[PDB]
Amino acid sequence: PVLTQPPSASGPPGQSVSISCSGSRSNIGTNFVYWYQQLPGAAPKLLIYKNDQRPSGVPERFFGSKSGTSASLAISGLRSEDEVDYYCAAWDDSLSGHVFGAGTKVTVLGQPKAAPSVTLFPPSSEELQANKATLVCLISDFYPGAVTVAWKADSSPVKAGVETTTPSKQSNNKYAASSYLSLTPEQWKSHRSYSCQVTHEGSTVEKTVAPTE
Amino acid sequence: VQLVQSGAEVKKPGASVKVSCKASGYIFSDYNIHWVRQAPGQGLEWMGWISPDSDDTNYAQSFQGRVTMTRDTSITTVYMELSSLRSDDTAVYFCARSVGYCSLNSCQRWMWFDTWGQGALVTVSSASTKGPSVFPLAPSTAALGCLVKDYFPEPVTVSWNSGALTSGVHTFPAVLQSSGLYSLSSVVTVPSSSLGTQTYICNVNHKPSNTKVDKKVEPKS
Amino acid sequence: FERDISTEIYQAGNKPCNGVAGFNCYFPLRSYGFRPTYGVGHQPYRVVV
């Protein structure tokens, strides 16, 4: 079956942090263990083959071994290439095929806090004449990502068919959340005003603009 | 050696999808291939192995009847197809070549995936293929944004002033919709003294639709 | 004239090994590195009796 690994393990650079990989009677111990790393948005590659050695191009920095029914890996020096995830792999007989691990994330132990900046934009007259209107309000330039957007029509939050994405890493190591909500424009016309007060870290900010501006 | 493979795009569920792996440089008669899948935010999973010089085959204990296989030794390729696709099968597929050669069951111990093939994310959804619809927007330094809606399929390219405006551009990641379509927004930052004195143009291009649509954003009083 | 097939591990020490191997108890099967880069003393000879 699957192999139980911690989801995350971190340490400051310059020292050694280790990863454990438990195994059953048939999963490991009677067989050989291999490890694979993968760059994010790329293809995985071999790290340790035949339980001790490394292929050409992989330096002496990497090390891993097993003792009983579990295996351990050792790294030393976290600068630019060890922020990727690692996988524990072996072979067994119950599934008659390769069984792989869950996944291990390794980070390093740093950016200043950025307040959220939500900017609501009213519809143009071209949308008013075309009988279309989408409630939009987006949050950007904030770290760490903990935003929670609310669709409040000046009296109560609105939650029906809410389409919300996840924050992503931009080119400046920031986050940019987004959320859309399409309604009939007569409901917006019946609304007195609109505001999307984002609750990030506790610093709630209000940006109210008139529908007619 | 290089392991280029051809991916696929969004498709209706339950159909047949074709993904192929090309072998280059090395001789394609002595190395097994292995198929693996990677769901986003999840561990890898094993499919089976297929010999290049024989019709040798083997599958996992869970994925047996929904998978077949085809060889084209003259084209020096292998052919991979999926029948009766599921919702939770939107996973990137790797054409993994293992070093050595094994066809026996007890041979699999000494096998490590020496090289891998770059994968393309295959997705399954339903929505008519049409041009993007740009939704006009008014500004709230006050910034303005450009909203595009119901584009299908991915991706779309946003350009400002037909490429003349380069500074201040900022895109946003794609979102999901309950109806199956996709949405995207592009917001730029402009100085507060140039909302009405200088008017910018927002343009979008969608190469699967082979059409171009232009508008003229105007701030409202 | 006795073929013997077995995937069980053979113990070579004081401790009894049931599913652990690598240090004192070994797996009884080793593979051939059949490569054409050798000379004549390591090529696979197809022997029939």
Place this chain on the structure above:
Amino acid sequence: FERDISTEIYQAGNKPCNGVAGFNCYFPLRSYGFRPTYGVGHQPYRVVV
């Protein structure tokens, strides 16, 4: 299968070194450091052959 001990400074090039440490002359004996802070991959193993 032979042992060697020395203390003279090794010259990697044409620099004449007879007791001084130049930029091309390095001491051929470098020591370790063994602390519990180090992980499994940086700890001494009493390897006997």
Place this chain on the structure above:
Amino acid sequence: YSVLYNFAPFFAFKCYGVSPTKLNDLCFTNVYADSFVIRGNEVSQIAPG
């Protein structure tokens, strides 16, 4: 060699010769016993060739 397997679990025990269990069946006259300490990341290249 019966009092050899009580000095903690090992790390590498690969050999290119006779088995440790059959050492009692063959009687010897000369064996080299030399030991040293290396960092655990450098045990892997102690191999013939």
